[PDB]
């Protein structure tokens, strides 16, 4: 892996250092329907006029971004996503801005969020959860080797593609950092205790969040839940975790090592790095290269009926995409 990652870093750094800009414009697409939303962004299925291809267009209102103090995070999101390349990371096809909004146009991943399948089916069997987990382990090995921390792992940000494999989306909190950082950001159920306790933290928070993800996939509910975030933070900080009766002993052992409040003990954070996870008994049946190569049979393949089908996505209320005749926040977003 060390040879592959070295070359991967060279490729990434060229793009990190000279990012792509302004590679499309709004009137090149017809907007069709909203696919999903987050706290201040909307992603729409669109059709590109000259190619006929569909894409997923993330639209951010620049004034909302500034009001919520997310300028730096948004510049991070686009600078990093345009620079990465890995089989389980969604591809950014175009980006541009206009007087009012920022646009990130990705490949459309039609199989829907992992979230919706997970809630509907209830939970995933351990082989099913393990197939998805292995892809995240490989993706975090890749991202961390570029000095990137991802910081927002959750089923709502994981899309299932037409072959049943994962595409990670939402680089909103991704950040290139050597050593520690302090921003309180993420999703409450997925936050590592060191984030909540404000002491400064590093890429080990992504391995914690992997533990949450695996738990939630295999249990059908998170290891720490409640009706309000403060109550969740209390449970995370207690760190007490209880497991469903049906979890295997191997899964329980892995999760105690990922949901480890002690950073000198947390898997992914030790001397052997990601190999403590890759070599754990729960992953004994996983062929790590075949996963990378996408040669493993997926446990589940969402129905797909045609270019532009959105039936694997919930419906959303639509709103006008307004573009003012006055430029908003031009200086702030110059490099976008």
């Amino acid at each position: 892996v060390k040879e592959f990652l070295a070359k991967a870093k060279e490729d990434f750094l060229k793009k990190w250092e000279t990012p792509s800009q302004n590679t499309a414009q709004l009137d090149q697409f017809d907007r069709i329907k909203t696919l999903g939303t987050g706290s201040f962004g909307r992603v729409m299925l669109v059709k590109h006029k000259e190619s006929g291809n569909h894409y997923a267009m993330k639209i951010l209102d620049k004034q909302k971004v500034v009001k919520l103090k997310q300028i730096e995070h948004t510049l991070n999101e686009k600078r990093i996503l345009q620079a990465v390349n890995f089989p389980f990371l969604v591809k950014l096809e175009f980006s541009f801005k206009d007087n009012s909004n920022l646009y990130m146009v990705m490949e459309y991943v039609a199989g829907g969020e992992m979230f919706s399948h997970l809630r509907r089916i209830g939970r995933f069997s351990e082989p099913h959860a393990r197939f998805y987990a292995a892809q995240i382990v490989l993706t975090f090995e890749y991202l961390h080797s570029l000095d990137l921390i991802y910081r927002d792992l959750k089923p709502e940000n994981l899309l299932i593609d037409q072959q049943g494999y994962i595409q990670v989306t939402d680089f909103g909190f991704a950040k290139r950092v050597k050593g520690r950082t302090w921003t309180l950001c993420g999703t409450p159920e997925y936050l590592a205790p060191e984030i909540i306790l404000s002491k400064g933290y590093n890429k080990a928070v992504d391995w914690w969040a992997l533990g949450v993800l695996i738990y939630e996939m295999a249990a059908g509910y998170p290891p720490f839940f409640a009706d309000q975030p403060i109550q969740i933070y209390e449970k995370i900080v207690s760190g007490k975790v209880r497991f469903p009766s049906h979890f295997s002993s191997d899964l329980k052992d892995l999760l105690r090592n990922l949901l480890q409040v002690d950073l000198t003990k947390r898997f992914g954070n030790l001397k052997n790095g990601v190999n403590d996870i890759k070599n754990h008994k729960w992953f004994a049946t996983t062929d790590w290269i075949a996963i990378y190569q996408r040669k493993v049979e997926a446990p589940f393949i969402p129905k797909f009926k045609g270019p532009g089908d959105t039936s694997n996505f919930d419906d959303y209320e639509e709103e006008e995409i307004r573009v003012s005749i006055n430029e908003k926040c031009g200086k702030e977003f110059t490099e976008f």
Binding site: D152, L184, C185, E189, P244
Partner: peptide, 20 residues
Amino acid sequence: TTYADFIASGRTGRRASIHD
């Protein structure tokens, strides 16, 4: 059951990010 307690709670739908 833990399942029943989760399903009756108010955080079973899509979760938004926080960023403070």
